[PDB]
PDB file of N, CA and C in Angstrom:
ATOM      1  N   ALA O   1       0.572  -1.346  17.123  1.00 53.46           N
ATOM      2  CA  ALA O   1       1.243  -1.474  15.846  1.00 53.46           C
ATOM      3  C   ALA O   1       0.674  -2.306  14.722  1.00 53.46           C
ATOM      4  N   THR O   2      -0.013  -3.372  14.946  1.00 56.16           N
ATOM      5  CA  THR O   2      -0.937  -3.975  14.103  1.00 56.16           C
ATOM      6  C   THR O   2      -2.185  -3.195  13.765  1.00 56.16           C
ATOM      7  N   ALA O   3      -2.664  -2.253  14.593  1.00 57.53           N
ATOM      8  CA  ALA O   3      -3.790  -1.596  14.179  1.00 57.53           C
ATOM      9  C   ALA O   3      -3.268  -0.706  13.319  1.00 57.53           C
ATOM     10  N   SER O   4      -2.333   0.131  13.589  1.00 58.71           N
ATOM     11  CA  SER O   4      -1.616   1.300  12.570  1.00 58.71           C
ATOM     12  C   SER O   4      -1.288   0.713  11.284  1.00 58.71           C
ATOM     13  N   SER O   5      -0.877  -0.553  11.452  1.00 54.73           N
ATOM     14  CA  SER O   5      -0.396  -1.471  10.353  1.00 54.73           C
ATOM     15  C   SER O   5      -1.361  -1.428   9.227  1.00 54.73           C
ATOM     16  N   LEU O   6      -2.493  -1.893   9.465  1.00 54.05           N
ATOM     17  CA  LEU O   6      -3.654  -2.199   8.609  1.00 54.05           C
ATOM     18  C   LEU O   6      -3.952  -1.105   7.850  1.00 54.05           C
ATOM     19  N   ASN O   7      -3.558   0.417   7.714  1.00 54.34           N
ATOM     20  CA  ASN O   7      -3.856   1.411   6.696  1.00 54.34           C
ATOM     21  C   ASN O   7      -3.207   0.865   5.518  1.00 54.34           C
ATOM     22  N   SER O   8      -2.267   0.372   5.464  1.00 55.71           N
ATOM     23  CA  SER O   8      -1.477   0.027   4.197  1.00 55.71           C
ATOM     24  C   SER O   8      -2.409  -0.944   3.409  1.00 55.71           C
ATOM     25  N   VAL O   9      -2.614  -2.074   4.121  1.00 52.23           N
ATOM     26  CA  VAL O   9      -3.527  -3.141   3.736  1.00 52.23           C
ATOM     27  C   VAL O   9      -4.721  -2.328   2.756  1.00 52.23           C
ATOM     28  N   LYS O  10      -5.431  -1.315   3.889  1.00 49.11           N
ATOM     29  CA  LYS O  10      -6.606  -0.606   3.262  1.00 49.11           C
ATOM     30  C   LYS O  10      -6.097  -0.044   1.469  1.00 49.11           C
ATOM     31  N   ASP O  11      -4.971   0.717   1.801  1.00 50.98           N
ATOM     32  CA  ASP O  11      -4.544   1.555   0.938  1.00 50.98           C
ATOM     33  C   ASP O  11      -4.194   0.740  -0.439  1.00 50.98           C
ATOM     34  N   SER O  12      -3.672  -0.469  -0.407  1.00 50.20           N
ATOM     35  CA  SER O  12      -3.277  -1.611  -1.315  1.00 50.20           C
ATOM     36  C   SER O  12      -4.764  -2.249  -1.901  1.00 50.20           C
ATOM     37  N   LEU O  13      -5.809  -2.521  -0.958  1.00 50.07           N
ATOM     38  CA  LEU O  13      -6.880  -2.885  -1.465  1.00 50.07           C
ATOM     39  C   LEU O  13      -8.002  -2.168  -2.366  1.00 50.07           C
ATOM     40  N   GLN O  14      -7.949  -0.574  -2.007  1.00 52.70           N
ATOM     41  CA  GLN O  14      -8.514   0.352  -2.618  1.00 52.70           C
ATOM     42  C   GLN O  14      -7.836   0.637  -4.361  1.00 52.70           C
ATOM     43  N   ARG O  15      -6.351   0.423  -3.983  1.00 53.98           N
ATOM     44  CA  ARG O  15      -5.906   0.695  -5.487  1.00 53.98           C
ATOM     45  C   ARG O  15      -5.992  -0.525  -6.348  1.00 53.98           C
ATOM     46  N   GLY O  16      -6.147  -1.747  -5.645  1.00 50.72           N
ATOM     47  CA  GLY O  16      -6.300  -2.865  -6.822  1.00 50.72           C
ATOM     48  C   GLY O  16      -7.762  -2.634  -7.300  1.00 50.72           C
ATOM     49  N   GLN O  17      -8.852  -2.206  -6.424  1.00 52.11           N
ATOM     50  CA  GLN O  17     -10.081  -2.005  -6.781  1.00 52.11           C
ATOM     51  C   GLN O  17     -10.015  -0.784  -7.916  1.00 52.11           C
ATOM     52  N   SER O  18      -9.175   0.405  -7.846  1.00 51.33           N
ATOM     53  CA  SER O  18      -8.751   0.998  -8.839  1.00 51.33           C
ATOM     54  C   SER O  18      -8.549   0.423 -10.025  1.00 51.33           C
ATOM     55  N   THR O  19      -7.535  -0.227  -9.791  1.00 50.18           N
ATOM     56  CA  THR O  19      -7.056  -0.784 -11.366  1.00 50.18           C
ATOM     57  C   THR O  19      -7.892  -1.653 -11.812  1.00 50.18           C
ATOM     58  N   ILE O  20      -8.754  -2.746 -11.279  1.00 53.40           N
ATOM     59  CA  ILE O  20      -9.932  -3.239 -11.817  1.00 53.40           C
ATOM     60  C   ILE O  20     -10.699  -2.352 -12.505  1.00 53.40           C
ATOM     61  N   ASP O  21     -11.037  -0.930 -12.237  1.00 56.06           N
ATOM     62  CA  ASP O  21     -12.055  -0.350 -12.242  1.00 56.06           C
ATOM     63  C   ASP O  21     -11.502   0.059 -13.676  1.00 56.06           C
ATOM     64  N   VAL O  22     -10.165   0.564 -13.870  1.00 53.54           N
ATOM     65  CA  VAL O  22      -9.731   0.667 -15.092  1.00 53.54           C
ATOM     66  C   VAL O  22     -10.056  -0.280 -16.179  1.00 53.54           C
ATOM     67  N   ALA O  23      -9.745  -1.561 -15.818  1.00 50.90           N
ATOM     68  CA  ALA O  23      -9.828  -2.680 -16.585  1.00 50.90           C
ATOM     69  C   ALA O  23     -11.052  -2.985 -17.267  1.00 50.90           C
ATOM     70  N   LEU O  24     -12.116  -2.609 -16.228  1.00 48.10           N
ATOM     71  CA  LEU O  24     -13.322  -3.069 -16.807  1.00 48.10           C
ATOM     72  C   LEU O  24     -13.694  -1.866 -18.129  1.00 48.10           C
ATOM     73  N   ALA O  25     -13.228  -0.709 -17.859  1.00 45.26           N
ATOM     74  CA  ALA O  25     -13.501   0.778 -18.419  1.00 45.26           C
ATOM     75  C   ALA O  25     -13.107   0.473 -20.014  1.00 45.26           C
ATOM     76  N   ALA O  26     -11.466  -0.206 -20.006  1.00 48.32           N
ATOM     77  CA  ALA O  26     -11.294  -0.943 -21.112  1.00 48.32           C
ATOM     78  C   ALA O  26     -11.833  -1.896 -22.232  1.00 48.32           C
ATOM     79  N   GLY O  27     -12.352  -2.927 -20.825  1.00 47.98           N
ATOM     80  CA  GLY O  27     -13.094  -4.127 -21.491  1.00 47.98           C
ATOM     81  C   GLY O  27     -14.551  -3.849 -22.218  1.00 47.98           C
ATOM     82  N   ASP O  28     -15.238  -2.507 -21.550  1.00 47.87           N
ATOM     83  CA  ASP O  28     -16.416  -2.182 -22.385  1.00 47.87           C
ATOM     84  C   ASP O  28     -16.093  -2.071 -23.803  1.00 47.87           C
ATOM     85  N   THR O  29     -15.417  -0.939 -24.180  1.00 48.68           N
ATOM     86  CA  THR O  29     -14.776  -0.585 -25.548  1.00 48.68           C
ATOM     87  C   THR O  29     -14.362  -2.069 -26.148  1.00 48.68           C
ATOM     88  N   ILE O  30     -13.335  -2.956 -25.668  1.00 50.13           N
ATOM     89  CA  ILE O  30     -13.178  -3.916 -26.235  1.00 50.13           C
ATOM     90  C   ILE O  30     -14.345  -4.937 -26.448  1.00 50.13           C
ATOM     91  N   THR O  31     -15.230  -4.934 -25.769  1.00 51.10           N
ATOM     92  CA  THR O  31     -16.328  -5.867 -26.115  1.00 51.10           C
ATOM     93  C   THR O  31     -17.375  -5.416 -27.440  1.00 51.10           C
ATOM     94  N   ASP O  32     -17.552  -4.001 -27.015  1.00 55.14           N
ATOM     95  CA  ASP O  32     -18.329  -3.185 -28.159  1.00 55.14           C
ATOM     96  C   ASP O  32     -17.856  -3.423 -29.608  1.00 55.14           C
ATOM     97  N   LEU O  33     -16.174  -3.404 -29.635  1.00 56.01           N
ATOM     98  CA  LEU O  33     -15.548  -3.567 -30.910  1.00 56.01           C
ATOM     99  C   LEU O  33     -15.612  -5.059 -31.622  1.00 56.01           C
ATOM    100  N   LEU O  34     -15.464  -6.077 -30.210  1.00 55.70           N
ATOM    101  CA  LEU O  34     -15.829  -7.617 -30.748  1.00 55.70           C
ATOM    102  C   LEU O  34     -17.065  -7.579 -31.291  1.00 55.70           C
ATOM    103  N   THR O  35     -18.179  -6.872 -30.992  1.00 57.49           N
ATOM    104  CA  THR O  35     -19.608  -7.203 -31.371  1.00 57.49           C
ATOM    105  C   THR O  35     -19.580  -6.465 -32.674  1.00 57.49           C
ATOM    106  N   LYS O  36     -18.835  -5.664 -32.957  1.00 54.56           N
ATOM    107  CA  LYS O  36     -19.129  -4.870 -34.200  1.00 54.56           C
ATOM    108  C   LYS O  36     -18.273  -5.822 -35.302  1.00 54.56           C
ATOM    109  N   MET O  37     -17.116  -6.248 -35.166  1.00 53.19           N
ATOM    110  CA  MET O  37     -16.325  -7.182 -35.711  1.00 53.19           C
ATOM    111  C   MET O  37     -17.207  -8.475 -36.066  1.00 53.19           C
ATOM    112  N   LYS O  38     -17.666  -8.945 -35.210  1.00 48.76           N
ATOM    113  CA  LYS O  38     -18.804 -10.148 -35.390  1.00 48.76           C
ATOM    114  C   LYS O  38     -19.849  -9.731 -36.340  1.00 48.76           C
ATOM    115  N   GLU O  39     -20.353  -8.304 -36.166  1.00 47.21           N
ATOM    116  CA  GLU O  39     -21.281  -8.300 -37.381  1.00 47.21           C
ATOM    117  C   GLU O  39     -20.630  -7.812 -38.851  1.00 47.21           C
ATOM    118  N   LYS O  40     -19.764  -7.530 -38.453  1.00 46.39           N
ATOM    119  CA  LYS O  40     -18.932  -7.329 -40.206  1.00 46.39           C
ATOM    120  C   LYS O  40     -18.676  -8.934 -40.534  1.00 46.39           C
ATOM    121  N   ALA O  41     -17.768  -9.829 -39.912  1.00 50.96           N
ATOM    122  CA  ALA O  41     -18.009 -10.981 -40.474  1.00 50.96           C
ATOM    123  C   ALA O  41     -18.878 -11.643 -41.022  1.00 50.96           C
ATOM    124  N   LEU O  42     -19.920 -11.561 -40.103  1.00 52.88           N
ATOM    125  CA  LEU O  42     -21.330 -11.898 -40.519  1.00 52.88           C
ATOM    126  C   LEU O  42     -22.252 -11.687 -41.839  1.00 52.88           C
ATOM    127  N   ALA O  43     -21.791 -10.118 -41.936  1.00 52.65           N
ATOM    128  CA  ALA O  43     -22.525  -9.725 -43.345  1.00 52.65           C
ATOM    129  C   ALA O  43     -21.406  -9.958 -44.282  1.00 52.65           C
ATOM    130  N   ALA O  44     -20.336 -10.420 -44.073  1.00 53.06           N
ATOM    131  CA  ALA O  44     -19.106 -10.378 -45.066  1.00 53.06           C
ATOM    132  C   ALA O  44     -19.459 -11.952 -45.609  1.00 53.06           C
ATOM    133  N   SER O  45     -19.888 -12.818 -44.618  1.00 53.22           N
ATOM    134  CA  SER O  45     -20.074 -14.392 -45.093  1.00 53.22           C
ATOM    135  C   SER O  45     -20.988 -14.517 -46.320  1.00 53.22           C
ATOM    136  N   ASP O  46     -22.004 -13.404 -46.496  1.00 53.55           N
ATOM    137  CA  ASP O  46     -22.818 -13.874 -47.511  1.00 53.55           C
ATOM    138  C   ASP O  46     -22.049 -13.570 -48.852  1.00 53.55           C
ATOM    139  N   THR O  47     -22.377 -14.382 -49.885  1.00 51.34           N
ATOM    140  CA  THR O  47     -21.907 -13.974 -51.447  1.00 51.34           C
ATOM    141  C   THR O  47     -22.558 -13.166 -52.083  1.00 51.34           C
ATOM    142  N   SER O  48     -23.842 -12.725 -51.778  1.00 48.69           N
ATOM    143  CA  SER O  48     -24.782 -11.654 -52.417  1.00 48.69           C
ATOM    144  C   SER O  48     -23.931 -10.288 -52.685  1.00 48.69           C
ATOM    145  N   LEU O  49     -23.021  -9.998 -51.860  1.00 45.74           N
ATOM    146  CA  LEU O  49     -22.291  -8.951 -51.803  1.00 45.74           C
ATOM    147  C   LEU O  49     -21.277  -8.929 -52.995  1.00 45.74           C
ATOM    148  N   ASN O  50     -21.040  -7.426 -53.749  1.00 47.85           N
ATOM    149  CA  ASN O  50     -20.273  -7.472 -54.584  1.00 47.85           C
ATOM    150  C   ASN O  50     -18.683  -7.390 -54.098  1.00 47.85           C
ATOM    151  N   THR O  51     -17.527  -6.740 -54.951  1.00 47.73           N
ATOM    152  CA  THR O  51     -16.307  -6.980 -54.383  1.00 47.73           C
ATOM    153  C   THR O  51     -16.157  -5.649 -53.214  1.00 47.73           C
ATOM    154  N   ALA O  52     -17.041  -4.477 -53.732  1.00 45.20           N
ATOM    155  CA  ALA O  52     -16.602  -3.448 -52.946  1.00 45.20           C
ATOM    156  C   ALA O  52     -17.163  -3.453 -51.509  1.00 45.20           C
ATOM    157  N   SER O  53     -18.653  -4.073 -51.468  1.00 45.93           N
ATOM    158  CA  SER O  53     -19.089  -4.132 -49.967  1.00 45.93           C
ATOM    159  C   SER O  53     -18.189  -4.844 -49.570  1.00 45.93           C
ATOM    160  N   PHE O  54     -17.317  -5.987 -50.106  1.00 45.29           N
ATOM    161  CA  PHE O  54     -16.659  -6.886 -49.350  1.00 45.29           C
ATOM    162  C   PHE O  54     -15.402  -6.034 -48.968  1.00 45.29           C
ATOM    163  N   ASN O  55     -14.692  -5.154 -49.605  1.00 45.17           N
ATOM    164  CA  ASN O  55     -14.028  -4.229 -49.074  1.00 45.17           C
ATOM    165  C   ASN O  55     -14.149  -3.496 -48.346  1.00 45.17           C
TER     166      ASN O  55
ATOM    167  N   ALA G   1      27.002   7.189  61.847  1.00 44.70           N
ATOM    168  CA  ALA G   1      27.257   6.914  60.580  1.00 44.70           C
ATOM    169  C   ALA G   1      26.815   6.053  59.320  1.00 44.70           C
ATOM    170  N   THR G   2      26.334   4.946  59.693  1.00 44.95           N
ATOM    171  CA  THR G   2      25.555   4.172  59.002  1.00 44.95           C
ATOM    172  C   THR G   2      24.567   4.811  58.434  1.00 44.95           C
ATOM    173  N   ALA G   3      23.801   5.460  59.484  1.00 44.20           N
ATOM    174  CA  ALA G   3      22.662   6.428  58.715  1.00 44.20           C
ATOM    175  C   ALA G   3      23.109   7.280  57.948  1.00 44.20           C
ATOM    176  N   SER G   4      24.136   8.043  58.017  1.00 44.15           N
ATOM    177  CA  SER G   4      24.641   9.189  57.364  1.00 44.15           C
ATOM    178  C   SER G   4      24.899   8.346  55.873  1.00 44.15           C
ATOM    179  N   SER G   5      25.398   7.405  56.025  1.00 42.64           N
ATOM    180  CA  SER G   5      26.167   6.751  54.644  1.00 42.64           C
ATOM    181  C   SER G   5      24.889   6.729  53.756  1.00 42.64           C
ATOM    182  N   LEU G   6      23.674   6.452  54.045  1.00 42.21           N
ATOM    183  CA  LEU G   6      22.435   5.943  53.067  1.00 42.21           C
ATOM    184  C   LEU G   6      22.060   7.284  52.126  1.00 42.21           C
ATOM    185  N   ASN G   7      22.607   8.617  52.454  1.00 43.60           N
ATOM    186  CA  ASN G   7      22.201   9.653  51.427  1.00 43.60           C
ATOM    187  C   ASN G   7      23.013   9.555  50.128  1.00 43.60           C
ATOM    188  N   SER G   8      24.395   8.904  50.178  1.00 44.01           N
ATOM    189  CA  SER G   8      24.802   8.537  48.887  1.00 44.01           C
ATOM    190  C   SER G   8      23.945   7.707  48.133  1.00 44.01           C
ATOM    191  N   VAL G   9      23.247   6.366  48.742  1.00 45.25           N
ATOM    192  CA  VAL G   9      22.918   5.761  48.255  1.00 45.25           C
ATOM    193  C   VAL G   9      21.393   6.050  47.535  1.00 45.25           C
ATOM    194  N   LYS G  10      20.525   6.970  48.269  1.00 47.48           N
ATOM    195  CA  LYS G  10      19.377   7.558  47.966  1.00 47.48           C
ATOM    196  C   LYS G  10      19.934   8.781  46.354  1.00 47.48           C
ATOM    197  N   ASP G  11      20.983   8.962  46.730  1.00 47.89           N
ATOM    198  CA  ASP G  11      21.565   9.943  45.387  1.00 47.89           C
ATOM    199  C   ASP G  11      21.828   9.116  44.108  1.00 47.89           C
ATOM    200  N   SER G  12      22.295   7.829  44.208  1.00 45.71           N
ATOM    201  CA  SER G  12      22.762   6.841  43.295  1.00 45.71           C
ATOM    202  C   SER G  12      21.201   6.209  42.386  1.00 45.71           C
ATOM    203  N   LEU G  13      20.492   6.111  43.490  1.00 48.83           N
ATOM    204  CA  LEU G  13      19.031   5.764  43.176  1.00 48.83           C
ATOM    205  C   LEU G  13      18.513   6.395  42.141  1.00 48.83           C
ATOM    206  N   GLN G  14      18.411   7.873  42.599  1.00 48.86           N
ATOM    207  CA  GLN G  14      17.822   8.807  41.731  1.00 48.86           C
ATOM    208  C   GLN G  14      18.134   9.148  40.629  1.00 48.86           C
ATOM    209  N   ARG G  15      19.681   8.902  40.394  1.00 47.97           N
ATOM    210  CA  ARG G  15      20.433   8.819  39.040  1.00 47.97           C
ATOM    211  C   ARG G  15      20.097   7.920  38.413  1.00 47.97           C
ATOM    212  N   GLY G  16      19.977   6.551  39.135  1.00 46.10           N
ATOM    213  CA  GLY G  16      19.539   5.490  37.843  1.00 46.10           C
ATOM    214  C   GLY G  16      18.199   5.640  37.464  1.00 46.10           C
ATOM    215  N   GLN G  17      17.246   6.297  38.183  1.00 44.84           N
ATOM    216  CA  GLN G  17      15.925   6.896  37.798  1.00 44.84           C
ATOM    217  C   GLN G  17      15.600   7.639  36.545  1.00 44.84           C
ATOM    218  N   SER G  18      16.875   8.692  36.631  1.00 44.79           N
ATOM    219  CA  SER G  18      17.070   9.746  35.720  1.00 44.79           C
ATOM    220  C   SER G  18      17.530   9.186  34.647  1.00 44.79           C
ATOM    221  N   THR G  19      18.472   8.258  34.619  1.00 45.96           N
ATOM    222  CA  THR G  19      19.223   7.732  33.433  1.00 45.96           C
ATOM    223  C   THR G  19      17.989   6.673  32.699  1.00 45.96           C
ATOM    224  N   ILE G  20      17.394   6.090  33.239  1.00 45.41           N
ATOM    225  CA  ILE G  20      16.089   5.349  32.820  1.00 45.41           C
ATOM    226  C   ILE G  20      15.122   5.970  32.060  1.00 45.41           C
ATOM    227  N   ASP G  21      14.888   7.430  32.557  1.00 46.06           N
ATOM    228  CA  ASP G  21      14.236   7.993  31.955  1.00 46.06           C
ATOM    229  C   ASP G  21      14.408   8.842  30.988  1.00 46.06           C
ATOM    230  N   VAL G  22      15.662   8.992  30.576  1.00 45.83           N
ATOM    231  CA  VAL G  22      16.271   9.535  29.307  1.00 45.83           C
ATOM    232  C   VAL G  22      15.950   8.298  28.374  1.00 45.83           C
ATOM    233  N   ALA G  23      16.415   6.844  28.749  1.00 42.89           N
ATOM    234  CA  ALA G  23      16.401   6.091  28.246  1.00 42.89           C
ATOM    235  C   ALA G  23      14.867   5.933  27.560  1.00 42.89           C
ATOM    236  N   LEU G  24      14.054   5.800  28.358  1.00 42.49           N
ATOM    237  CA  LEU G  24      12.733   5.768  27.958  1.00 42.49           C
ATOM    238  C   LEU G  24      12.015   6.681  26.755  1.00 42.49           C
ATOM    239  N   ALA G  25      12.756   8.122  27.210  1.00 43.62           N
ATOM    240  CA  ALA G  25      12.353   9.206  26.330  1.00 43.62           C
ATOM    241  C   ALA G  25      13.001   8.951  24.884  1.00 43.62           C
ATOM    242  N   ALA G  26      13.919   8.391  24.861  1.00 43.35           N
ATOM    243  CA  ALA G  26      14.556   7.625  23.527  1.00 43.35           C
ATOM    244  C   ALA G  26      13.897   6.896  22.951  1.00 43.35           C
ATOM    245  N   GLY G  27      13.152   5.829  23.876  1.00 43.65           N
ATOM    246  CA  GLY G  27      13.002   4.982  23.282  1.00 43.65           C
ATOM    247  C   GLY G  27      11.253   4.953  22.591  1.00 43.65           C
ATOM    248  N   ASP G  28      10.606   5.989  23.026  1.00 47.54           N
ATOM    249  CA  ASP G  28       9.446   6.423  22.352  1.00 47.54           C
ATOM    250  C   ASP G  28       9.419   6.964  20.736  1.00 47.54           C
ATOM    251  N   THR G  29      10.654   7.517  20.546  1.00 43.01           N
ATOM    252  CA  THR G  29      11.093   8.093  19.328  1.00 43.01           C
ATOM    253  C   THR G  29      11.276   6.725  18.787  1.00 43.01           C
ATOM    254  N   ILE G  30      12.233   5.853  19.391  1.00 42.09           N
ATOM    255  CA  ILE G  30      12.739   4.825  18.405  1.00 42.09           C
ATOM    256  C   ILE G  30      11.407   3.779  17.946  1.00 42.09           C
ATOM    257  N   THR G  31      10.701   3.455  18.707  1.00 40.77           N
ATOM    258  CA  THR G  31       9.252   2.629  18.412  1.00 40.77           C
ATOM    259  C   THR G  31       8.459   3.357  17.654  1.00 40.77           C
ATOM    260  N   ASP G  32       8.248   4.783  17.480  1.00 42.43           N
ATOM    261  CA  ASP G  32       7.505   5.214  16.539  1.00 42.43           C
ATOM    262  C   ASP G  32       8.142   5.099  15.178  1.00 42.43           C
ATOM    263  N   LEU G  33       9.454   5.256  15.146  1.00 40.53           N
ATOM    264  CA  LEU G  33      10.088   5.348  13.830  1.00 40.53           C
ATOM    265  C   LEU G  33      10.118   3.921  13.346  1.00 40.53           C
ATOM    266  N   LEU G  34      10.273   3.018  14.313  1.00 41.38           N
ATOM    267  CA  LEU G  34      10.237   1.514  14.151  1.00 41.38           C
ATOM    268  C   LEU G  34       8.699   1.144  13.258  1.00 41.38           C
ATOM    269  N   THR G  35       7.878   1.735  13.990  1.00 43.31           N
ATOM    270  CA  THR G  35       6.355   1.343  13.644  1.00 43.31           C
ATOM    271  C   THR G  35       5.998   2.036  11.912  1.00 43.31           C
ATOM    272  N   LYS G  36       6.451   3.145  11.664  1.00 41.87           N
ATOM    273  CA  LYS G  36       6.435   3.872  10.324  1.00 41.87           C
ATOM    274  C   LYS G  36       7.643   3.226   9.287  1.00 41.87           C
ATOM    275  N   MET G  37       8.576   2.576   9.950  1.00 40.85           N
ATOM    276  CA  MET G  37       9.398   1.798   8.840  1.00 40.85           C
ATOM    277  C   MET G  37       8.435   0.532   8.589  1.00 40.85           C
ATOM    278  N   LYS G  38       7.995  -0.146   9.557  1.00 41.39           N
ATOM    279  CA  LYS G  38       7.103  -1.313   9.286  1.00 41.39           C
ATOM    280  C   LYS G  38       5.800  -1.172   8.186  1.00 41.39           C
ATOM    281  N   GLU G  39       5.289   0.042   8.418  1.00 41.78           N
ATOM    282  CA  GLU G  39       4.533   0.488   7.244  1.00 41.78           C
ATOM    283  C   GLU G  39       5.081   0.913   5.779  1.00 41.78           C
ATOM    284  N   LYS G  40       6.386   1.405   5.663  1.00 42.71           N
ATOM    285  CA  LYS G  40       6.770   1.469   4.624  1.00 42.71           C
ATOM    286  C   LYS G  40       7.341   0.372   4.186  1.00 42.71           C
ATOM    287  N   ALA G  41       8.037  -0.606   4.771  1.00 42.24           N
ATOM    288  CA  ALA G  41       7.976  -2.060   3.987  1.00 42.24           C
ATOM    289  C   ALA G  41       6.704  -2.674   3.650  1.00 42.24           C
ATOM    290  N   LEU G  42       5.490  -2.446   3.970  1.00 44.13           N
ATOM    291  CA  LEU G  42       4.253  -2.681   3.843  1.00 44.13           C
ATOM    292  C   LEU G  42       4.143  -2.372   2.598  1.00 44.13           C
ATOM    293  N   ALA G  43       3.961  -1.230   2.388  1.00 45.44           N
ATOM    294  CA  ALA G  43       3.600  -0.482   1.024  1.00 45.44           C
ATOM    295  C   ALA G  43       4.683  -0.753  -0.137  1.00 45.44           C
ATOM    296  N   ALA G  44       5.823  -0.942   0.223  1.00 43.74           N
ATOM    297  CA  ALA G  44       6.747  -1.540  -0.544  1.00 43.74           C
ATOM    298  C   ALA G  44       6.854  -3.008  -1.185  1.00 43.74           C
ATOM    299  N   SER G  45       6.099  -3.541  -0.225  1.00 45.38           N
ATOM    300  CA  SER G  45       5.858  -5.090  -0.775  1.00 45.38           C
ATOM    301  C   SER G  45       4.750  -4.930  -1.871  1.00 45.38           C
ATOM    302  N   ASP G  46       4.035  -4.214  -2.052  1.00 46.68           N
ATOM    303  CA  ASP G  46       2.738  -4.486  -3.072  1.00 46.68           C
ATOM    304  C   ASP G  46       3.709  -4.339  -4.307  1.00 46.68           C
ATOM    305  N   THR G  47       3.189  -5.217  -5.075  1.00 47.13           N
ATOM    306  CA  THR G  47       3.402  -5.605  -6.619  1.00 47.13           C
ATOM    307  C   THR G  47       2.861  -4.527  -7.514  1.00 47.13           C
ATOM    308  N   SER G  48       2.021  -3.728  -7.164  1.00 47.69           N
ATOM    309  CA  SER G  48       1.052  -2.901  -7.715  1.00 47.69           C
ATOM    310  C   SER G  48       1.589  -1.576  -7.629  1.00 47.69           C
ATOM    311  N   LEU G  49       2.518  -1.079  -7.233  1.00 45.02           N
ATOM    312  CA  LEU G  49       3.187   0.238  -7.258  1.00 45.02           C
ATOM    313  C   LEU G  49       4.239   0.426  -8.279  1.00 45.02           C
ATOM    314  N   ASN G  50       4.229   1.715  -8.624  1.00 46.73           N
ATOM    315  CA  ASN G  50       5.312   2.171  -9.844  1.00 46.73           C
ATOM    316  C   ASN G  50       6.418   2.218  -9.039  1.00 46.73           C
ATOM    317  N   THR G  51       7.615   2.420  -9.875  1.00 46.97           N
ATOM    318  CA  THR G  51       9.046   2.505  -9.531  1.00 46.97           C
ATOM    319  C   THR G  51       9.312   3.495  -8.907  1.00 46.97           C
ATOM    320  N   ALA G  52       8.473   4.582  -8.968  1.00 45.15           N
ATOM    321  CA  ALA G  52       8.422   6.072  -8.359  1.00 45.15           C
ATOM    322  C   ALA G  52       8.348   6.018  -6.748  1.00 45.15           C
ATOM    323  N   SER G  53       6.981   5.163  -6.735  1.00 44.42           N
ATOM    324  CA  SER G  53       6.326   4.892  -5.455  1.00 44.42           C
ATOM    325  C   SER G  53       7.326   4.238  -4.669  1.00 44.42           C
ATOM    326  N   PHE G  54       7.993   3.424  -5.094  1.00 44.75           N
ATOM    327  CA  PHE G  54       8.857   2.444  -4.514  1.00 44.75           C
ATOM    328  C   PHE G  54      10.215   3.191  -3.835  1.00 44.75           C
ATOM    329  N   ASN G  55      10.612   3.977  -4.827  1.00 42.31           N
ATOM    330  CA  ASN G  55      11.828   4.957  -4.687  1.00 42.31           C
ATOM    331  C   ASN G  55      11.506   5.870  -3.633  1.00 42.31           C
TER     332      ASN G  55
END
């Protein structure tokens, strides 16, 4: 009964790994977007741009 | 007469053996359903399941 009981534990573990995989797949996009936002704020910090490039 | 009386005793013992056999034949099914019920309770305990899987 214990040996047959372990299959649900294995299923829950694979389900948790799949959920973490989806989380990392979203985190890749979130990280590249944060990097592009840092690049935009860094370029915008400069005072040599005119108003149009700032907007 | 005492020797002849024992045939009824053997009949009662065989009757009890048959009744216990029927009880064990039902207990096989009862234990199997109990094991599957334990597996369902294990799967239901997980917090990562959606409402339809729990239902």
